[model samples]
Target: AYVCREASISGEIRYPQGTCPTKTEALNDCNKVTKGLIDFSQSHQRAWGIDMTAKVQCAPCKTTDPWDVVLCTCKITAHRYREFVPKIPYSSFSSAPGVIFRQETGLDHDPEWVVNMKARTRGCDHHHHH
Candidate 1:
């Protein structure tokens, strides 16, 4: 029995090609948020790129105002999650020895005590390692 965890992310974009483009172009262009999110999700974030989610909100903010400045075009939101299997690191009582192999899931930071506590929770001991 293995335990798995996942994280969520939402990337958004609004297309305003000099001026508002046609609806077709708006939909296609705004969808660029997915590739952006995918890059983050699968790259440094180290996520498995799961949970397909997205949305399109076409709202015209600037009806008649070039005004040197204009509002954005349709808004596209790509909400997604990535999957991972957490490996509770096990080692010596203190980190003074054996920094080889078996790294904890590099998702976020955890307190040193918390890491030890979780190690205990996972039935780790006996000095055996991989």
Candidate 2:
């Protein structure tokens, strides 16, 4: 059996009520709106398998001009496992537009997120008997 840590993030950006002159301001506003979601996901462990830290990044919306949004990134070991789980076994809950969730798998490094665990795991098979 293999154990690994994982981190996963999910969220959306909404067009603010007013139009901003620069993309930077729009992105900043999006980040503010979703800040609570990111904070809750990282601070509240009851919803996920492990604790987590989060970072927010912004990019221009590809579909529309003059639109910008913030994205979520995982910054902790525990959250890495939760994101890589593939199948999240948890209840559904409503949240702000942008939120990232994470969990812990006891592994020191977050294999699935930062590294290729499948290839790494294959090399470890030699230690086990067939």
| Residues 9-128, model 2: lDDT tens digits | 433334453332255554454444346434544465423333444443444344554454333232322233432335332233233344323232333432123432443222211233
The C-alpha RMSD of each candidate to the native structure, in angstroms, is 15.5, 11.7
Supply the TM-score for candidate 2.
0.33
TM-score of 1: 0.37
lDDT of 2 at 8: 40
lDDT, model 1, position 23: 59
How many residue pairs clash in model 1?
A: 0
Residue 86, model 2: lDDT of 51
Per-residue C-alpha lDDT of model 1 across residues 1-130, encoded as one tens digit per residue: 3222332222223344446655565445434444443454454343324233334444464656663222223222222222233322222211322111112233343212121112212211122474
Show where candidate 2 strays beyond 4 Å.
Answer: 19-47, 60-86, 89-91, 95-130
